[PDB]
Design an enzyme around this catalytic site. Structure first.
Site, mmCIF file in Angstrom:
data_model
loop_
_atom_site.group_PDB
_atom_site.id
_atom_site.type_symbol
_atom_site.label_atom_id
_atom_site.label_comp_id
_atom_site.label_asym_id
_atom_site.label_seq_id
_atom_site.Cartn_x
_atom_site.Cartn_y
_atom_site.Cartn_z
ATOM 1 C CG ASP C 56 -1.738 -1.224 1.353
ATOM 2 O OD1 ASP C 56 -1.612 -2.111 0.492
ATOM 3 O OD2 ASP C 56 -2.529 -1.310 2.311
ATOM 4 C CG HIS C 58 -3.229 3.843 1.812
ATOM 5 N ND1 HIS C 58 -2.914 2.593 2.298
ATOM 6 C CD2 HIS C 58 -4.560 3.829 1.576
ATOM 7 C CE1 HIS C 58 -4.007 1.856 2.355
ATOM 8 N NE2 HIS C 58 -5.020 2.582 1.921
ATOM 9 C CG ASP C 84 -5.391 -0.222 -0.236
ATOM 10 O OD1 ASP C 84 -6.422 -0.292 -0.925
ATOM 11 O OD2 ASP C 84 -5.321 -0.661 0.932
ATOM 12 C CG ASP C 87 -8.922 6.657 0.307
ATOM 13 O OD1 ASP C 87 -9.194 7.849 0.090
ATOM 14 O OD2 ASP C 87 -9.758 5.740 0.297
ATOM 15 N NE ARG C 88 -5.779 5.356 6.511
ATOM 16 C CZ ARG C 88 -6.236 5.034 7.717
ATOM 17 N NH1 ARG C 88 -7.541 4.930 7.929
ATOM 18 N NH2 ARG C 88 -5.388 4.815 8.712
ATOM 19 C CG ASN C 116 -9.282 -2.320 0.712
ATOM 20 O OD1 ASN C 116 -8.068 -2.357 0.535
ATOM 21 N ND2 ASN C 116 -9.831 -1.736 1.762
ATOM 22 C CG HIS C 117 -8.669 2.124 0.266
ATOM 23 N ND1 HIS C 117 -9.013 3.231 1.007
ATOM 24 C CD2 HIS C 117 -8.418 1.140 1.159
ATOM 25 C CE1 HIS C 117 -8.970 2.932 2.291
ATOM 26 N NE2 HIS C 117 -8.613 1.668 2.411
ATOM 27 C CG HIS C 166 -5.126 -5.095 -1.699
ATOM 28 N ND1 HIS C 166 -4.051 -4.260 -1.498
ATOM 29 C CD2 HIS C 166 -6.088 -4.680 -0.844
ATOM 30 C CE1 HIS C 166 -4.351 -3.375 -0.568
ATOM 31 N NE2 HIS C 166 -5.584 -3.604 -0.157
ATOM 32 N NE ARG C 213 -8.669 -5.323 6.711
ATOM 33 C CZ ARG C 213 -7.546 -4.638 6.722
ATOM 34 N NH1 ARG C 213 -7.576 -3.342 6.917
ATOM 35 N NH2 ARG C 213 -6.404 -5.256 6.543
ATOM 36 C CG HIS C 240 -6.000 -5.295 2.983
ATOM 37 N ND1 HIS C 240 -6.494 -4.045 2.680
ATOM 38 C CD2 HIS C 240 -7.034 -5.995 3.502
ATOM 39 C CE1 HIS C 240 -7.770 -3.991 3.014
ATOM 40 N NE2 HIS C 240 -8.122 -5.160 3.515
HETATM 41 MN MN MN Z 1 -4.479 -0.151 2.765
HETATM 42 MN MN MN Z 2 -6.316 -2.313 1.721
#
Ligand code: MN
Ligand code: MN
Lengths: 488, 579, 308
Positions: C56, C58, C84, C87-88, C116-117, C166, C213, C240
């Site tokens: 990731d 991110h 990923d 994000d973040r 997943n993002h 992932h 999750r 992940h």
């Molecule tokens: Mn992640």
């Molecule tokens: Mn993830």
């Protein structure tokens, strides 16, 4: 009848990975103006003493606990001199709640001096980083290292104020405007347990000292004015708004011009700060409690919320829609028709939003039958605003939950009144190029130039600080809710 | 040209369409005559407009440039009504833009209508009801003071003293922020009698956010006073600001300490500023110690030369021996950035006795930013002590840092290596430091590998081509058989930087048979790095080998299965002009 | 392919390397160029032997540029990312624009997978929809990128022996031929085989468990040992999950979690790692710290939320 929502100590959703833990977040630098000699022997007990050497023993117990110890640099220095202060502070707390007629007027200067040397200090540099890339909800709290002694000073002062023999005419010469301003500077403390005692102490001081009420309300405004316009960083906005929520419930009903200017110029610009999610349940209580007090202020509140409507912050747009439904729940039908065309032009943008949390929060207004009551009495001009926003986006949304809610909202309009008009085909297509009538005259001005639901919420994957968390759940609160304080 | 058309466009219910139609307000004023924009356009902006703060921000930015479109510098006071309304708006980004535009307009004013139109505008903002107007009045006193009469500028000093004694701390914070700027345009006897009592009151204020802004005003006040009355006017205010109970005020004294040293003078620096500097280095707050550690070189540079080495060796140096072993990491990293700079001040023998154990104690520190800051000034100690003394005391610490855990610390030794090897001589480099530069070429971090190839170019300019042909050319040619493809490309990266400095004979006879051999490499990434290297070393070879040994290899790589090998070979055929 | 586009494409990578975003019309032409490349890739992508495997990112762009200083520049070092990317972090737009632009320019050197993002719903809960609003003024770049995210491959198979994905395994998938039968050109569902491939996690419980999750499952050591034997795999690389050392072995060295975001969300204080596979498929992990931040951290009045 109603109380403000109590501020939670730990406001971070920790449902991520719990196997990773932190390193207790220890404070770095200790304090200024400490003492050199810290020798303290155990004085005799107050209950076992005879009844005439009572106040002088109580003064000497209060002449102790004014020596400040060190918990930050060397955390295990003077453990026998620290415990005699801790047992001495615990003795004075247990002495003041059970016995009667214990406070003379020669006890009032020493109890204020004991408070002012222990807690009134310059708060240490903030351990949380600041910047645009930091979420202000995910700031980890940093506990005060002197809390084995600072807790019992807050506990002593609170039981001192709430004693039945407390005389506010005697204590008003020692609890003055310099005491209040030094107490309001401590609301920026990063310890949530410290802010909880300051909220309860300031609520008692505002309740009993009628000569300080205009001063407390003015100095709180100076804290918010710096917070809104200058720094945008303060750790105790939610604690001050919980105090002000109890003040608003006690206002006199012919509402003063000082309080109306506090709603428009202080409470409404608090909605535009980036960290609104920290103090939003307390801010939305103070706004609604004004409109229960005087419903004539409903028009400048709603047009002030639409002025600060966030456009680059979608979690704040859901919080605006959540607060706006609470205002519309208590709105009068005469105030609704004065404001509904700026109101429903914003809801037309929120229903047609690509954000699924913004769209589904505005489409839940149709489940409120009181809002649907006011819409049906104004359907001659609230329907042509909302009908293009629902019909242009009936099938064009990536989420299929919003496909159901838009169709659910559209069938409540057709059953309300049979306005089955189909003039969306010309009033869109003629105004395709009616904006191009004004574009060629925009070019005509250049013709004369000259002289140039676990997944539905934002969680934090930070490692927990399990010592700090269980210390925040072990802290019992000083008071669960703040009662109202009537205006004089 | 029609006023009744654009009045509704600027009052259109869309907010974005009001924003584009008001950012083009210059083109509307250009289309209008310079007389009708005074009579219709500007009263319309005065009367009608009040809106979103994004519109008001765009409106305040345009009106600072309308000094020509309104009729020139003798009609510029018609821009004062609209700009006064934007100076009272609650939002801080628009009333800061309005007070910025109000200062640019004030220079176009005559000295006669400054007292007629601009000074009554300042006096109405300074006596406003809300704090947003009194805050914007504080930034307008300096641009209108030195061009008005003595009776008017006596009123401007009274209106600034009322803002320094304001009820709200938001105005007192803004009055102290402009106290030094306002004092630079006053005459000397009015600074001495009116600025000093209002500077001394802002430093005893109950709010520490007001008190720390009086410290920055103390620098500007002390530098325009004579030296004789700095002791009786400024010095007791500065002495109590260094002993302030708030750490934020002690931080501002330490952060502005070298500016206070030049402004006050070299004689009071010995008496008051040297003991005040020892108390800031031995401070209870780690933010104040780190700020007083950044200034420890510049403070000792500007001491009086009759007593420079006596004050440092007796007062400063015992205090910096304890900041080396400090607990906080920011104060250790801040001292290490400047501790090597006071090596020419103490001389050669004081550096060996007193400063060299402090350098070795920071070359072995557990923090990587302490080790980074102490390497970056290693040449400054090299000009004080000799290369015979550097190679005895500090060179075993430099060789040990060549295999450091953090790769940023490893990178700092490589950048110092061509400077160190040139002074040590070629016979010392081949015996004890040649294996260090070759071990960097097979490092795991790529940025160490590419810094070692550029190190090999700087080494052979200082030692010659026949040193490279005998020592480092057979070391980088045996790297071509490494089974890791990341290291086989390092041979190609070394040849790209060595071919331009070792000339045509070493490139053709020693390095060109290696780049042509690994053109049949199995990994595709090596195969176009061969074609990217034959483009680079191509012009250095002569035309005979470029047509009989390079061109048949580049034609074979255009028949490759990989698309990137096929592209970079086709790109190298046109740059080498072999198509 | 055509030569005047690649010199335009090479300018975008050079512009993006200075942390400068592309224009809205350039992102639209880029995401349609990458759509033609990714639509002919299988659900399990075949990657050759020398490759660097990343976790990731991110949105941490300055730590992505640090990642290229540990493993090498993009055409020289073959890379493989595990979703990923948006994000973040503060620079989510510049992170995913660079990684997609390297995929159009160097389609045999980069392989970007789906995390997943990279779905419509998860990227609106966190701050990537707001980031395209803040940086571009409207929601078109968000619509271009999330429609590109539907065409990203789910898994990857390096040399037939190392399985990269992932999230993790699923009770509906037991064979690599079952991943090929999935339909991946859709938004990530809330349950099913495609959902658990990007949401699952390993643990030490044994058997299928309830993934806390909210989406996904948790699989024990007995499942990854069964999944490796049924397909001829020696390692199921993953990510992940935040790990403090940067990498983490689990399940008797059958799976490995790789996380390539150092100091996750600028709070966590963790290291990162990348896994380098050499020409004979031997792994080695390079740990690295965050990049040093250089600039002017002064008091800049942020632009308010209601200015648009
Ligand atoms: Mn992640
Ligand atoms: Mn993830």
């Amino acid at each position: 009848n109603s109380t403000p929502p109590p501020t939670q100590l730990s406001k971070i959703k920790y449902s991520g990975g719990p196997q990773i833990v932190k390193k207790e977040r220890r404070q770095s630098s200790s304090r200024f103006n400490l003492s050199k000699n810290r020798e303290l022997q155990k004085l005799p007990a107050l209950k076992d003493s005879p009844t005439q050497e009572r106040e002088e023993l109580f003064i000497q117990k209060l002449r102790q606990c004014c020596v400040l110890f060190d918990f930050v640099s060397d955390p295990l220095s003077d453990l026998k001199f620290k415990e005699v202060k801790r047992a001495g502070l615990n003795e004075m707390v247990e002495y003041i709640t059970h016995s009667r007629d214990v406070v003379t007027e020669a006890i009032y200067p020493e109890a204020v001096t004991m408070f002012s040397v222990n807690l009134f200090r310059t708060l240490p540099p903030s351990s949380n980083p600041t910047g645009a890339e930091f979420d202000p909800k995910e700031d980890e709290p940093t506990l005060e290292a002197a809390w084995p002694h600072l807790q019992l000073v807050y506990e002593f002062f609170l039981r001192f104020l709430e004693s039945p023999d407390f005389q506010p005419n005697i204590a008003k010469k020692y609890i003055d405007q310099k005491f209040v301003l030094a107490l309001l500077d401590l609301f920026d403390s990063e310890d949530p347990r410290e802010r909880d005692f300051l909220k309860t102490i300031l609520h008692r001081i505002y309740g009993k000292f009628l000569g300080l009420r205009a001063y407390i309300r003015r100095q709180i405004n100076h804290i918010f004015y710096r917070f809104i316009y200058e720094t945008e960083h303060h750790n105790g906005i939610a604690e001050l708004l919980e105090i002000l929520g109890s003040i608003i419930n006690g206002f006199a009903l012919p509402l003063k011009e000082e309080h109306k200017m506090f709603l428009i110029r202080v409470l409404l610009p608090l909605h535009k700060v980036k960290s609104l999610s920290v103090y939003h349940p307390q801010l939305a209580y103070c706004v609604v409690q004004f409109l229960e007090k005087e419903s004539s202020l409903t028009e400048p509140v709603i047009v002030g919320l639409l002025k600060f409507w966030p456009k680059t912050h979608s979690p704040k747009e859901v919080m605006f829609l959540n607060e706006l439904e609470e205002i519309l729940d208590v709105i009068e039908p005469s105030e609704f028709s004065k404001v509904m065309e700026p109101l429903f032009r914003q809801l037309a943008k929120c229903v047609s939003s690509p954000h699924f949390q913004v769209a589904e929060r505005a489409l839940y207004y149709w489940n409120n039958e009181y809002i649907m009551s006011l819409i049906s009495d104004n359907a001659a001009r609230v329907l042509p605003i909302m009908f293009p926003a629902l019909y242009r986006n009936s099938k064009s949304h990536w989420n299929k939950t919003i496909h159901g809610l838009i169709y659910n909202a559209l069938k409540l309009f057709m059953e309300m009144n049979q306005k089955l008009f189909d003039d969306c085909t010309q009033q869109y297509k003629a105004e395709k190029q009616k904006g191009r009538f004004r574009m060629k005259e925009r070019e005509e001005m250049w013709q004369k130039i000259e002289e140039l639901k676990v997944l539905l919420r934002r969680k934090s994957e930070l490692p927990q600080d399990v010592y700090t968390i269980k210390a925040l759940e072990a802290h019992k609160r000083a008071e669960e809710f703040l009662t109202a304080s009537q205006e004089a | 040209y029609p006023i009744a058309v654009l009045i509704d466009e600027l009052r259109n219910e869309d907010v974005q369409l009001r924003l584009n139609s008001i950012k083009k307000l210059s083109t509307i004023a250009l289309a209008l005559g310079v007389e009708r924009t005074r009579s219709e356009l500007l009263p319309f902006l005065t009367d009608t407009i009040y809106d979103e703060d994004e519109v008001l921000l765009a409106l305040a930015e345009q009106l600072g440039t309308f000094t020509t479109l309104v009729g020139g510098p003798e009609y510029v006071h018609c821009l004062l009504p609209p700009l006064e309304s934007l100076a009272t708006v609650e939002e801080t980004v628009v009333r800061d833009k309005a007070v910025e535009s109000l200062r640019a307009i004030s220079h176009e004013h005559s000295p006669s209508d400054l007292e007629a139109h601009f000074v009554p505008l300042v006096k109405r903002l300074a006596g406003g009801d809300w704090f947003t107007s009194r805050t914007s009045a504080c930034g307008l006193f300096s641009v209108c003071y030195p061009r008005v009469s003595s009776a008017v500028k006596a009123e401007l000093r009274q209106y600034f003293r009322n803002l320094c004694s304001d009820d709200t701390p938001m105005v007192r914070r803004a009055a102290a922020s402009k106290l030094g700027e306002f004092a630079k345009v006053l005459e000397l006897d009015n600074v001495k009698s009116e600025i000093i009592p209002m500077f001394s009151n802002l430093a005893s204020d109950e709010q520490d956010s007001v008190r720390l802004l009086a410290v920055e005003a103390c620098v500007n006040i002390a530098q325009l006073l004579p030296q004789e009355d700095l002791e009786a006017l400024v010095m007791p205010t500065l002495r109590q600001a260094a002993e302030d109970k708030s750490w934020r005020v002690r931080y501002m004294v330490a952060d502005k300490f070298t500016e206070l040293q030049k402004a006050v003078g070299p004689e009071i620096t010995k008496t008051d500023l040297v003991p005040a500097f020892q108390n800031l280095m031995k401070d209870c707050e780690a933010e104040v110690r780190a700020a007083a550690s950044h200034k420890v070189k510049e403070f000792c540079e500007n001491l009086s030369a009759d007593c420079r080495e006596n004050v440092i060796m007796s007062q400063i140096l015992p205090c910096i021996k304890e900041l080396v072993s400090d607990a906080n990491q920011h104060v250790k990293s801040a001292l290490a950035s400047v501790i090597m700079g006071l090596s020419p001040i103490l001389g050669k023998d004081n550096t060996i006795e007193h400063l060299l154990p402090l350098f070795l104690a920071q070359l072995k520190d557990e923090c990587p930013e302490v080790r980074l800051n102490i390497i970056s000034n290693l040449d400054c100690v090299n000009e004080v002590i000799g290369i015979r003394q550097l190679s005895q005391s500090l060179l075993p610490a430099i060789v040990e840092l060549a295999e450091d855990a953090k790769w940023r610390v490893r990178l700092a030794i490589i950048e110092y290596m061509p400077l160190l090897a040139g002074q040590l001589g070629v016979e010392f480099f081949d015996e004890k430091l040649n294996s260090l530069c070759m071990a960097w070429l097979v490092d795991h971090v790529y940025a160490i590998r590419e810094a070692a190839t550029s190190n090999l170019k700087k080494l052979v300019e200082k030692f010659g081509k026949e040193w490279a042909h005998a020592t480092i050319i057979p070391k980088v040619l045996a790297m071509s058989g490494d089974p890791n493809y990341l290291h086989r490309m390092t041979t190609l990266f070394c040849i790209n930087v060595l071919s331009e400095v070792c000339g045509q004979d070493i490139t053709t006879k020693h390095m060109l048979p290696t780049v042509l051999r690994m053109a049949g490499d199995p990994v595709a990434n090596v195969r176009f790095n061969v074609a990217k290297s034959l483009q680079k070393i191509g012009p250095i070879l002569d035309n005979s080998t470029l047509q009989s040994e390079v061109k048949p290899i580049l034609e074979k790589l255009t028949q490759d299965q990989d698309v990137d090998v096929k592209y970079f070979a086709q790109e190298a055929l046109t740059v080498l002009s072999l198509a | 392919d055509e030569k005047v586009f690649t010199k335009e494409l090479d300018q975008w990578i050079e512009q993006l390397n200075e942390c400068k975003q592309l224009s809205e019309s350039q992102v639209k032409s880029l995401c349609e160029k990458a759509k033609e490349i990714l639509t002919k890739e299988s659900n399990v992508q075949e990657v050759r032997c020398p490759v660097t495997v990343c976790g990731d990112v991110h949105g941490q762009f300055h730590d992505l540029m640090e990642l290229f200083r540990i493993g090498g520049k993009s055409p020289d070092t073959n890379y493989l990312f595990m979703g990923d990317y948006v994000d973040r972090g503060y620079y989510s737009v510049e992170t995913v624009t660079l990684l997609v632009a390297l995929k159009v320019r160097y389609r045999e050197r980069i392989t970007i997978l789906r995390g997943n993002h990279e779905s419509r719903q998860i990227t609106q809960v966190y701050g990537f929809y707001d980031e395209c609003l803040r940086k571009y003024g409207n929601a078109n770049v968000w619509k271009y990128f999330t429609d590109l995210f539907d065409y990203l491959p789910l898994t990857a198979l390096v040399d037939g022996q190392i399985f990269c994905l992932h999230g993790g395994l699923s009770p509906s998938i037991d064979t690599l031929d079952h991943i090929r039968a999935l339909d991946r050109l859709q938004e990530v569902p809330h349950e099913g085989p495609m959902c658990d491939l990007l949401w699952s996690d390993p643990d030490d419980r044994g058997g299928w468990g309830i993934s806390p999750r909210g989406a996904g499952y948790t699989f024990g050591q007995d499942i990854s040992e069964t999944f490796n034997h049924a397909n001829g795999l020696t390692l199921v690389s993953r990510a992940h999950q935040l790990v403090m050392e940067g990498y983490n072995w689990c399940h008797d060295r059958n799976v490995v979690t790789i996380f390539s975001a150092p100091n996750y969300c600028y709070r966590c204080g963790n290291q990162a790692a990348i896994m380098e596979l050499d020409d004979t498929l031997k792994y080695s992990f390079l740990q690295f710290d965050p990049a040093p931040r250089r600039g002017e951290p002064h008091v800049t009045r942020r632009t308010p939320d209601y200015f648009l």
